[model samples]
Target: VFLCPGLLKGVYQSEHLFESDHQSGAWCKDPLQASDKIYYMPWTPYRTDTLTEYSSKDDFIAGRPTTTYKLPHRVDGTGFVVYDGALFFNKERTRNIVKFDLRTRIKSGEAIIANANYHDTSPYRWGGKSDIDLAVDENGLWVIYATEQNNGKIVISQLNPYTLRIEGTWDTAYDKRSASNAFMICGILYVVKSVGNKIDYIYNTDQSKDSLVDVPFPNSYQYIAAVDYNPRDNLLYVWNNYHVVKYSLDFGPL
Candidate 1:
């Protein structure tokens, strides 16, 4: 799925014809026809009526404004997912976990997890340049963040969504550098640690014990972000600056 900047709503399929600065719309490709179709997702604007009801696609295309929900804090590069029935995301600017029930629209609740500010003996600030991304597993929600005062060491923290607390913490071991983002697949977490213009993948079986592995990519690509896994297809997907690529891991012995 992708966002349609022109329409300002999420577009699922767009025949691969419409393009925008944000690459807002996307669709699954049809192998036979070698083309795609447009699909639409519900749109909710920032600070509007809080709830504008729509019953048709035309209403959506006509820019019907709604304020179904809003992020607890301003965050970019934060990971998102629909767990159980709630929309869960990490507010990078505040290093807080936010949740909203899809079934019941509600706003402004305590964070499922709080920032790591209280434990510091010295003065420590948290926000934007600190926490970056989040993912969930059977255990609970996991977060990937940077230490502002510590040269941007990528720290991984496990969070309990119920109590909104940090259960465990570990470093990405990427030499105190910042990471672009991170994702959880199976029971492992994959992180993209970019050095200069180059990017590498670091995986951790458990947050406490992590390892780095360089993932090969086409030289033509310049930047990469938002790595995810599709359990249905058992494939991994990554978005470079211009395109999204998919890779399969089910390879037999050569």
Candidate 2:
């Protein structure tokens, strides 16, 4: 999830899909998603706690809502990401993942990750966002979790949508808390993490690697608000209010 004081952002349209649409004579891929709506869920200090939907990006930017509603449930800033018209978020302080159908505004289903309860010692306790960080790519939903026990070794799992099962699992040596966020591209997990005030590719979730080499990236990247890798065009889009940068890996598997 993109952490800011005010808003949660998701990519509504990609330049890749736009190009494809243009070539195929379609304004958008498929039947146009949710009337091309944009969702905003702002927390307490930013505004009142609420969920608002806008007609388009323009309306969203202008803060003119097509529809506004009180948040019927108690939820707050936590890790989440959007894919295929579904909003996936941690089932608040638990290791379970919940899916909200943005189109229908319905609580569709919840899937729990195995070995992912951050609070093993108790039922209701503190479990950091590091417990289950989520991302999505071409394959499906990916959850990255760190054991609150077990020396904090991370486990990566592919989740079954709307079902009570995990499709696959891979254990990684990468430190979970060290990562600010992660996204999958070309079926590989890449993390943006800080090392000595610089957030760079310190360690990757490589199947064969025992240890990863750290690179010296700009210290400023430590503040990049959110990151996502686009395998469609092979771009890692990193953006914040003041800066937007794209890192290209040239379409090769990492």
Candidate 3:
């Protein structure tokens, strides 16, 4: 069975493309199977609230957007995720997380994460104001960030998708800036090292288990700004040096 922290056999490239001229952006389907819609945010350093929606993966790769939405809040980084019919992302320059309804095309929920580092205080290696990362897995919505209280250690918090409330929290020994990117599998958090060739650390929120592992992860374009797992397709949606790419996950026995 596919379980938490399953053996990462290897990684292979799936799809590749440049969504826009922006060097960093995010593109992923609803990880929880909310919809087949693809969301793309061509990130800009300055404040912006633009999100391009595609009907499907086919449409997205073909340079077609079903509609473009003017988001209610500025999207800070490539950490956003589409989950349960809504888009959850880090609100630019703040410690707030915003949830926007895709169907209604409006802001639905918002909450401030206490003690979270924001606005590039402690971001991933590539650093796109990726202080707060929102991700989803088989379990539920999650928020990953660093905090001053923890001396810049990575903090993982489970969130109530609808209410945008923090339900649980886990502080890991890993440093946020030491990672090139990170993602969730089952309920385990895999931290990709800044070097980018392999995932060397993992923190399981389930049993509060933490350890080191040498799971091979590829860095095709070198600068990986964002990498997230989508349970719907079981692929890692990645943003590497301005290119949108996908990696087929090879999972085996737990």
Q: Best candidate per lDDT, number?
A: 3
Clashes of each: 6, 0, 0
Local distance difference test, each candidate: 0.41, 0.49, 0.79
lDDT (Cα, tens digit) per residue for candidate 1, span 139-233: 45667665544345556677665565767776555532344445555445655444432235554545356554554433433333344443333
**Least accurate stretch of 10 residues (summed lDDT) in model 1?**
2-11
Taking the tens digit of each residue's C-alpha lDDT, what string does model 2 give over 159-254?
Answer: 865573788777666666566666664345655566533223322333434334343334455432345554344445544322334444422223
Looking at candidate 2, what is the lDDT of residue 173?
69
Which clashing pairs does model 2 show? none
**RMSD of every prediction:** 10.2, 10.0, 2.5
RMSD of 3: 2.5
Runs of candidate 2 with Cα error greater than 4 angstroms are: 1-37, 43-51, 68-76, 117-130, 148-150, 196-219, 229-254
Q: Could you give candidate 3's per-residue lDDT for residues 7-36 as a string of tens digits?
A: 566677887765557777777887556566
Off by more than 4 A, model 3: 1-5, 17-19, 120-127, 219-221
Model 2 weakest 10-residue run by lDDT: 21-30
TM-score ranking from best candidate downward: 3, 2, 1
Q: What is the lDDT of residue 199 in candidate 2?
A: 29
Model 2 quality (TM-score):
0.63
